[PDB]
Amino acid sequence: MLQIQRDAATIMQPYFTSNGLVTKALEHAFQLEHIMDLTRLRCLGSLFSMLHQACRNVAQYNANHPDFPMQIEQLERYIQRYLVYAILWSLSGDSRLKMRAELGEYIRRITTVPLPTAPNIPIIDYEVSISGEWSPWQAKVPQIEVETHKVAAPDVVVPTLDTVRHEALLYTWLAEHKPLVLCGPPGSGKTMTLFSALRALPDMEVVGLNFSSATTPELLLKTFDHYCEYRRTPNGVVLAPVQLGKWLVLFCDEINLPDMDKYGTQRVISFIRQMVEHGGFYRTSDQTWVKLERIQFVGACNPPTDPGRKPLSHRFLRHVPVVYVDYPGPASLTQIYGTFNRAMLRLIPSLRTYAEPLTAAMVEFYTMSQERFTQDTQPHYIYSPREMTRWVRGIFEALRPLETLPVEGLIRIWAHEALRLFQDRLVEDEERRWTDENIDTVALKHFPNIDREKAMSRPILYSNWLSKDYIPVDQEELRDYVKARLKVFYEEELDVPLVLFNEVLDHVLRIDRIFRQPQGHLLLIGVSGAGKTTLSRFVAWMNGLSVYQIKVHRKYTGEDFDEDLRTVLRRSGCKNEKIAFIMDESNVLDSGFLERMNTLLANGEVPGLFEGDEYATLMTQCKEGAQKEGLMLDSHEELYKWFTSQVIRNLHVVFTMNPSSEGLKDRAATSPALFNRCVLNWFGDWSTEALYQVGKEFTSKMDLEKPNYIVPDYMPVVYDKLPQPPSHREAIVNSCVFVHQTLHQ
Amino acid sequence: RDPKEWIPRPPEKYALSGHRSPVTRVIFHPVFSVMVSASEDATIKVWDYETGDFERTLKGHTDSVQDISFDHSGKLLASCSADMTIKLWDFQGFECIRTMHGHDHNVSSVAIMPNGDHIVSASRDKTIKMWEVQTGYCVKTFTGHREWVRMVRPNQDGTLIASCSNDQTVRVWVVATKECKAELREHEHVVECISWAPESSYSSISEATPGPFLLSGSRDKTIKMWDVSTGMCLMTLVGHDNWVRGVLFHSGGKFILSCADDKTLRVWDYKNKRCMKTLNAHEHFVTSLDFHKTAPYVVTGSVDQTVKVWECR
Amino acid sequence: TTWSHHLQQANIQFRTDIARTEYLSNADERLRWQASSLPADDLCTENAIMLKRFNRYPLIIDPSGQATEFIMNEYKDRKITRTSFLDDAFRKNLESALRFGNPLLVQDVESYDPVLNPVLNREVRRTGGRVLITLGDQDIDLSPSFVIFLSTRDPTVEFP
Ligand SMILES: Nc1ncnc2c1ncn2[C@@H]1O[C@H](COP(=O)(O)OP(=O)(O)O)[C@@H](O)[C@H]1O
Ligand SMILES: Nc1ncnc2c1ncn2[C@@H]1O[C@H](COP(=O)(O)OP(=O)(O)O)[C@@H](O)[C@H]1O
């Protein structure tokens, strides 16, 4: 190892001294602009680590070829190209595609090093193999197909150019235990890339952490307490994972998010910088230096230009390389979801010729919806490939047991899923009509000679209550069924009468659709008194979900919330009962409430929540529950894993809050899980249409008909689609709607 | 034809109407040819099937009647309502025998074993109570459920009773050991209807897979049968389109009878793991049904205040 | 005026030559109110009409203190136990009122606690002929003749 290190050093010596190549490349990369501010030491340390991994690669090749070791000529040809590759991925890894292309063409212009001959293929699209030649990544990525069982599973990762390049980068970083940051927009694929890289290393265990705005180092201390232990050594106190021989990697998803103090500092970031540079942290229990044996880090963050994020300190960025993952774009997303649609459209063999136009329509609609609803208009108007993954998963779940479906039905389920993913979060009627019209015109453009009236209609509702299959339903029969179910429901849980209308039908269908899937958390935005809690309670009762209310009152400290969470998690994981954790914004008092909600909604487990004899009680209860279920568990790690999996499988959290022009932004800053792991349903205030139907239904059982009624010539109308000529009851319910509107005015 | 192969065919032989509230349970008298139904209008209605005519009015309850049960002779009738009362009726007198109290909530179910020495009932007060026929006293109360018990049904000899709750679990009990034999936590929703296999069905179930054999029907649109000896799901039957509220075994032991919330009644072949005939029962939802051991007649309660009498062939 | 203009525009005739105090309150009940320390103003009489014909339990923003005395004088035959939200002996008085079916008046609603949300929302369970409501950790039967009034002495208070 020392000999091959010396040979590599002697062959890369002419490229380092004075100007050479690295100095000019660095001074050009400084002129280039990046996502994060580029300190020279960060990229230099990144380049040094990648060259060390090159030496390790040569050593492993020598081990794999014991008869013929590494020849000096092939070694020099390999190093002379790995140096260019590493310089490119070090000085351009945190920038955009066009800027890394500019750095590549500048390097090609300036260097006297052999390079592949390509009129337009960038040097960044190449790999220096161990044989010493340039192997393109396009030959490395295959045109694979996935089975119908895993169509949109969280673990399936179809490979692309950017995917395999970031795979190689993350393997190179994690092979020598160096912290790294996966910066990029939400939904870009950073945690998917990290998990797919970690599953190629069987010697590492991943820990998921989600930072909030009110993040303190006590969260990392609790994680270290839960997943590691303190061991006394003659050289000091050493913190090591309990899993012997396994390297623990901590995944922090919101590095940029913790609030910067008034003096420009972040306590968690300074803590991480201290334990990265010095290799340890001070324990406040007895003021003793605690050293880390096998603890590495990986970070994820949105770009600092995002409204809720803060730039990182250069002293922390010095040790930590950052790579910028961008959105896949149209030309890659087309095959990324083309393989998924060709895999899923095998259950119905008569639709296999429509997978390519289906993918084209989905990509076109997603791109043309991305451009309009920017984050400037609303804080939750973020669109990501996570929405397309949920789209194909929903179409697969609707097409799974159906076994027979025409093209009109396929485009109609496409339109319904598009509505559910691109209308629930929307606010205004104008933009809702925009989405509806654009869905219609996209279907018209990409699906010619089809039955438009049969494919597209007004209600487009789908229930699984009238039938086991996920069939479309009609509004009148659905309303009759909901009437009968409410008549049954009044005598069991809540004896409060309700009036039903189309908005209520849509809301209960959406809430049932989100309750049916695992790990389904709601976020209902609307004015108080709109019936969100009652509708959620009715749907949870009809789906067989227990409803939990924390019953907040005076002097509600954090301990009461913690014991409520302990009871909810215990009954949801050990007793194995479906529970609908419904709680309003008024139930939130302190920042610890929202921190625990962030952790539970993100990972499904709260580290440090069960400490002391309650942890032993939880372990005994989980062992008893595993015995009752019929699968044996020993130790404590797999018991905790099974309990966590049960919590994801069972627990559903419903969050209700009033809309606000600053409260929503503050909530998004202080809890990203509410806007990431929860679907945002914007109930809003009751529309004039809803008020009109409520008034017309409620004022129907009393005598209000005058046969001699004169139609006014001016006819002041505030509810659109009013029948002409209106009757007396029509006029008075329109007057009631006008009265409500003038109170608003 | 032979009693083994009595199957219902459309349409219905009789169309009865006149109730002012949805029908809960319609069951067969064991001796004489008189129909009787229980509804939620605080009364019990009496009809006929060989002529399809009104017979007599029984008005003793004050709140919504939930369940009714018969003895072996048919001379005793036990009914339960929402007034936390238990009322007894007779066939030889057609009057009120006794009025009992002690339940803390609505009494969901009552059951009379063929011995007839005492009447067991299940209520919504998280308890199961059995009361004697000579004194009307709750000598022993079965407890151990956490939600309201929906239906209770013992076996043919009364040596082992079973009950269903909302804990996705059916519990079997013994009138001597006073403790649960086995807990059966396999369903995913509320269990509503429980049936017991006759003596003729034991060999059929054994050759399809001793006894006794237990079948449980739940709201999860699935029907499964269970065995006391092994405590394991024998086979899973899937295909009921909506919520299942009533199940019953065939007297021949080869088929089953069940009703669903989709306004249909279906007959299933557990040998072929598939149904063989589906009929549109009523214009609205249905609740329960029953089958006669000898007479070729089958009825089905409903919600639209209509009871339809079907002749098997 | 806006509602009357709209109803005139929509050709729905309404009695213009009437007072909203006189059409809603009878002479005998007006005399009873004036005997029970109510001010003779038409605004105060309209407030009394609202306090009589309420459906949701009302909140009284009365800095002068006369409306509290008017409430205690109007509901004088029925016992009223005056208490405050911040008082430690408030929940016990609430359960006593819920059990015994007598009107209750609570002041200082700026210190509002969400324990009264099931009561204000009428989240009630029907046990046949028995009416049941559950708040906190105890189950209490609800009498039909129970009314609760919230009082305030600060006008410039912001309510969620
Ligand atoms: N190349 C790809 N192949 C398959 N799925 C992809 C690809 N790129 C993105 N995805 C989808 O995007 C999602 C990744 O988003 P995620 O990494 O969770 O973003 P963030 O970590 O910023 O929240 C995954 O659910 C995945 O299905
Ligand atoms: N569609 C409706 N018909 C009748 N009453 C309704 C309807 N929607 C809401 N309500 C009334 O409004 C109240 C809303 O209560 P809740 O849902 O707890 O508050 P929020 O609407 O803020 O979630 C209910 O008590 C109910 O009586």
DSSP A104-158: HHHHHHH--S-----SS--GGGEEE-TTSSEEEHHHHS------SS-SS-SS---
- Which residues in C lie closer than 8 A to residue B66 (C-beta atoms)? none
Name the neighbours of A, counting chains with at least 3 Cβ pairs within 8 A: B, C
Q: Which amino acid is it at B127?
A: T
- Which residues in C lie closer than 8 A to residue A536 (C-beta atoms)? none
Chain A contact for B146 (CB, 8 A cutoff): no
Contact A358, A414 (CB under 8 A): yes
CA atoms in the 13 A half-sphere facing the CB of B187: 30
Distance CA B96, CA C115 (A): 47
Residue A608 annotated as part of some ligand binding site: no
> Nearest by CB to A484, which of B241, B262, B285?
B285
Cα Rg for chain A, rounded, in angstroms? 30
Whether A328 is in the pocket of ligand 1, judged by its Cβ within 6 Å, is yes
- C128: nearest CA in chain B? B82
The residue to which tokens 């910066």 are assigned? A183
Q: How many CB atoms lie within 10 A of CB A177?
A: 14
- Which residues in B lie closer than 8 A to residue A468 (C-beta atoms)? 221, 240-242
Q: How many CB atoms lie within 10 A of CB A142?
A: 9
**How far is ligand 1, taken at its centre, from the CA of residue A405, in Å?**
29
**How far is ligand 1, taken at its centre, from the CA of residue A727, in Å?**
55
Name the neighbours of C, counting chains with at least 3 Cβ pairs within 8 A: A, B
Q: How many CB atoms lie within 10 A of CB A694?
A: 19
Phi, psi of A205 (to 5 degrees): -115, 135
Contact B182, B228 (CB under 8 A): yes
Distance CA A147, CA B188 (A): 29
CA-closest candidate to residue A246, choices A198, A291, A211, A208: A198
Residue A623 annotated as part of some ligand binding site: no
Distance CA A525, CA B104 (A): 41
- Which residues in A lie closer than 8 A to residue C121 (C-beta atoms)? 496
Distance CA A659, CA B27 (A): 56
The residue to which tokens 């001070």 are assigned? A282
Helix residue spans in chain C (DSSP H): 2-9, 20-24, 27-35, 42-52, 66-74, 91-100, 117-120
Distance CA C30, CA C24 (A): 10
Ligand nearest to the CA of C124: 2
Distance CA C119, CA C133 (A): 8
The number of helix segments (H) and strand segments (E) in chain A equals: 28, 18
Q: Are strands B233-238 and B222-227 parallel, antiparallel or unpaired?
A: antiparallel
Cis ω before B11 (30° cut-off from 0): yes
Whether A252 is in the pocket of ligand 1, judged by its Cβ within 6 Å, is no
Show the beta-strand stretches assigned E in C53-92.
59-61, 81-84
Whether A504 is in the pocket of ligand 2, judged by its Cβ within 6 Å, is yes
Distance in Å, alpha carbon of B205 to nearest chain A alpha carbon = 25
Q: SS3 of A613, please?
A: helix
The residue to which tokens 């984050």 are assigned? A375
Run of H or E residues at A251: strand A247-252
Residue A531 annotated as part of some ligand binding site: yes
Distance CA A440, CA C106 (A): 57
Sequence length of chain C is 160
Name, in order, each residue with C-beta under 8 angstroms of A400's C-beta and a sequence gap of 6 or more. A347
Token readout for A61 is: 């090749």
Q: Which amino acid is it at B120?
A: V
CA-closest candidate to residue A48, choices A91, A7, A77, A19: A91
Show the beta-strand stretches assigned E in A637-737.
651-657, 678-682
Mutate to test the interface with B, among A403, A466, A468 (most CBs of B within 10 A): A468
**How far is ligand 2, taken at its centre, from the CA of residue C115, in Å?**
18
Ligand nearest to the CA of A299: 1
Whether A572 is in the pocket of ligand 2, judged by its Cβ within 6 Å, is no
Token readout for A5 is: 């290190």
CB contact under 8 A, B105 and C127: yes
Distance in Å, alpha carbon of C129 to nearest chain A alpha carbon = 12
Whether A531 is in the pocket of ligand 2, judged by its Cβ within 6 Å, is yes
DSSP chain B: --GGG--B-SS-SEEEE--SS-EEEEEE-SSS--EEEEESSS-EEEE-SSS----EEE---SS----EEE-SSS-EEEEE-TTSEEEEEETTT-SEEEEEE--SS---EEEE-TT-SEEEEE-SSSEEEEEESSS--EEEEEE--SS---EEEE-SSSSSEEEE-SSSEEEEE-TTT-SEEEEEE--SS-EEEEEE--HHHHHHHHHH----EEEEEETTSEEEEEETTT-SEEEEEE---S-EEEEEE-TTSS-EEEEETTTEEEEEETTTTEEEEEEE--SS-EEEEEE-SSSSEEEEEESSSEEEEEEB-
- B104: nearest CA in chain C? C127
CA-closest candidate to residue A551, choices B29, B47, C123, B61: C123
Q: How many CB atoms lie within 10 A of CB A452?
A: 13
Distance CA A98, CA A102 (A): 6
Whether A188 is in the pocket of ligand 1, judged by its Cβ within 6 Å, is yes
Tell which atom from ligand 1 comes closest to the C-alpha of A185.
22
Name, in order, each residue with C-beta under 8 angstroms of A581's C-beta and a sequence gap of 6 or more. A548, A568, A651, A652, A653, A654
DSSP A560-574: HHHHHHHHHHHHHHT
Q: SS3 of A324, please?
A: strand
Residue A98 annotated as part of some ligand binding site: no
Dihedral sign, Cα of residue A574, residue A575, residue A577, residue A580:
negative
The residue to which tokens 């050709």 are assigned? C11
CA-closest candidate to residue A390, choices A489, A519, A495, A512: A519
Dihedral sign, Cα of residue C74, residue C122, residue C159, residue A554:
positive
- C128: nearest CA in chain A? A491
Q: Is A230 exposed, middle or buried (0-12, 13-18, 19+ CB in 10 A)?
A: middle
Experimental method for this entry? cryo-EM
Whether A693 is in the pocket of ligand 2, judged by its Cβ within 6 Å, is no
Q: How many CB atoms lie within 10 A of CB A626?
A: 19
Distance CA A346, CA A633 (A): 38
Cis ω before A725 (30° cut-off from 0): yes
Run of H or E residues at C107: strand C104-107
Q: Which residues pair with B308 in a beta bridge?
A: B15, B300
Contact B145, B165 (CB under 8 A): yes
Name, in order, each residue with C-beta under 8 angstroms of C91's C-beta and a sequence gap of 6 or more. C115, C136
Contact A38, A321 (CB under 8 A): no
CB contact under 8 A, A466 and B262: yes
Distance CA A742, CA A738 (A): 6
Distance CA B310, CA B300 (A): 8
- Closest residue to atom 26 of ligand 2, CA basis: A531
Contact B231, B184 (CB under 8 A): yes
Q: How many CB atoms lie within 10 A of CB A98?
A: 9
- Which residues in A lie closer than 8 A to residue C126 (C-beta atoms)? 490-491, 495
Cis ω before C160 (30° cut-off from 0): no
Mutate to test the interface with B, among C125, C126, C127 (most CBs of B within 10 A): C127
CA-closest candidate to residue A182, choices A196, A194, A174: A194
- Which residues in C lie closer than 8 A to residue B106 (C-beta atoms)? 127-128
Distance CA B136, CA A208 (A): 63
Distance in Å, alpha carbon of B106 to nearest chain C alpha carbon = 8
CB contact under 8 A, C124 and A496: yes
Q: Are strands C138-141 and C130-135 parallel, antiparallel or unpaired?
A: antiparallel
Ligand nearest to the CA of A298: 1
Tell which atom from ligand 2 comes closest to the C-alpha of A504.
1
Q: How many CB atoms lie within 10 A of CB B63?
A: 17
Phi, psi of A503 (to 5 degrees): -65, -40
Name, in order, each residue with C-beta under 8 angstroms of A476's C-beta and a sequence gap of 6 or more. none
Contact B198, B253 (CB under 8 A): yes
Distance in Å, alpha carbon of C128 to nearest chain B alpha carbon = 6
Q: SS3 of C114, please?
A: helix
Run of H or E residues at A547: strand A546-548
Tell which atom from ligand 1 comes closest to the C-alpha of A162.
1
Residue A54 annotated as part of some ligand binding site: no
Range A466-472 contact pairs with CB under 8 angstroms and sequence separation of 24 or more? A466/B242, A466/B262, A467/B241, A467/B242, A467/B262, A468/A401, A468/B221, A468/B240, A468/B241, A468/B242, A469/A401, A469/A402, A470/A397, A470/A398, A470/A401, A470/A402, A472/A409, A472/A412, A472/A416
The residue to which tokens 């050593």 are assigned? A59
- For the sheet containing C130-135, what is the strand order? C125-127, C130-135, C138-141
Q: Is C78 exposed, middle or buried (0-12, 13-18, 19+ CB in 10 A)?
A: exposed
**How far is ligand 2, taken at its centre, from the CA of residue A490, in Å?**
14
Tell which atom from ligand 1 comes closest to the C-alpha of A676.
23
Distance CA A443, CA A439 (A): 6
Q: How many CB atoms lie within 10 A of CB B231?
A: 12
Run of H or E residues at A340: helix A330-344
Buried-state track A261-272, b at ≥16 Cβ within 10 A, e below 16: eeeeebebbebb
CA angle, A405 as apex, A404 and A411 as ends, to 5°? 165
Q: Is A152 exposed, middle or buried (0-12, 13-18, 19+ CB in 10 A)?
A: buried
Q: How many CB atoms lie within 10 A of CB B79?
A: 22
Token readout for A313 is: 């300190």
DSSP collapsed to 3 states, A354-368: HHHHHHHHHHHHHHH
Q: Is A649 exposed, middle or buried (0-12, 13-18, 19+ CB in 10 A)?
A: middle
